[PDB]
């Protein structure tokens, strides 16, 4: 799966912001507009047994340039919530369900 970081009209959003993937599927998060961005998973809204420090970017690392990417594979089934650190109060939050 690929998820765009920012909307083309400048909206500070993941596109799509709610998606479904298969267990073991790789998600590539790609800079699209309005960067910098990063991705961080919420430690309270991931399945049990998942270590959020292994699947999140470090809070202070940023994707700064057009086309930059961050990829992560999710295996544990359930719902994961994630957000972009610099834009978290601006509404840049998303959800992925692993089936
Ligand atoms: Cu952002």
Curated annotation (Swiss-Prot):
The keyword Metal-binding appears for this protein: yes
Domain Plastocyanin-like: residue ranges: 1-99
Cofactor(s) needed: Cu(2+)
Keyword Plastid in record: yes
Its membrane topology: Peripheral membrane protein
Principal place of residence: plastid
Top-level lineage group: Eukaryota
Protein purpose: Participates in electron transfer between P700 and the cytochrome b6-f complex in photosystem I.
Family named by the database record: Belongs to the plastocyanin family.
Protein name, as recorded: Plastocyanin, chloroplastic
Protein source organism: Silene latifolia subsp. alba (White campion)
Whole-protein residues included: 67 to 165 of 165
């Amino acid at each position: 799966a690929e998820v765009l970081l920012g909307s083309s009209d400048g909206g500070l959003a993941f596109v799509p912001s709610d998606l479904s993937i298969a267990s073991g599927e790789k998600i590539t998060f790609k800079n699209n507009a309005g960067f910098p961005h990063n991705d961080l998973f919420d430690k309270k809204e991931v399945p049990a047994g998942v270590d959020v420090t292994k699947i999140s970017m470090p809070e202070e690392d940023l994707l700064n340039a057009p086309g930059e990417e961050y990829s992560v594979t999710l295996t544990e089934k359930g719902t994961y919530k994630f957000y972009c650190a610099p834009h978290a109060g601006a509404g840049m939050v998303g959800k992925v369900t692993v089936n």
